[PDB]
Design a protein around this ligand. Structure first.
Ligand SMILES: Nc1cc(F)ccc1C(=O)O
Length: 126
């Protein structure tokens, strides 16, 4: 159902939290080869998460679930802000710019946490 797709989406978000925290530790420790790999893994997780979110939103639209559509539109907009910051972080890593990388890491943490405050409402509305 749209709910089992939402639980999978939630699990993928949690996988990203796990891999992100491991990546942050590796960045702090100077292990650039590990960071590179975690960044690739986070990019794949973003693509998969986005695909699950799009299927949930499309199914809520086809079901006429107006409140779920509203909440999913808001959440996906914030999700995309996160993804844009993530892309800038990857670019800073490629460019050898640790100052910007650290800043984007902190910013991405705050933007993703902001979007997660909509999760309980979405789960209830689906
Ligand atoms: N795939 C991700 C990567 C990040 F760095 C942060 C968040 C996500 C996510 O899918 O929520």
């Amino acid at each position: 159902s749209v709910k089992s797709e939402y639980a999978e989406a939630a699990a993928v978000g949690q996988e990203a939290v796990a891999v992100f925290n491991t990546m942050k530790a590796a960045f702090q420790n100077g292990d650039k080869e590990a960071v590179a790999q975690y960044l690739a893994r986070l990019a794949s997780l973003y693509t998969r998460h986005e695909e699950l979110l799009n299927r949930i939103l499309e199914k809520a639209r086809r079901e006429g679930n107006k409140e779920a559509v509203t909440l999913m539109n808001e959440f996906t907009a914030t999700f995309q802000t996160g993804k844009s910051i993530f892309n800038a972080m990857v670019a800073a890593f490629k460019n050898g710019d640790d100052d910007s990388f650290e800043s984007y890491l902190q910013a991405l943490e705050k933007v993703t946490a902001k979007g997660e405050t909509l999760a309980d409402q979405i789960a209830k509305a689906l």
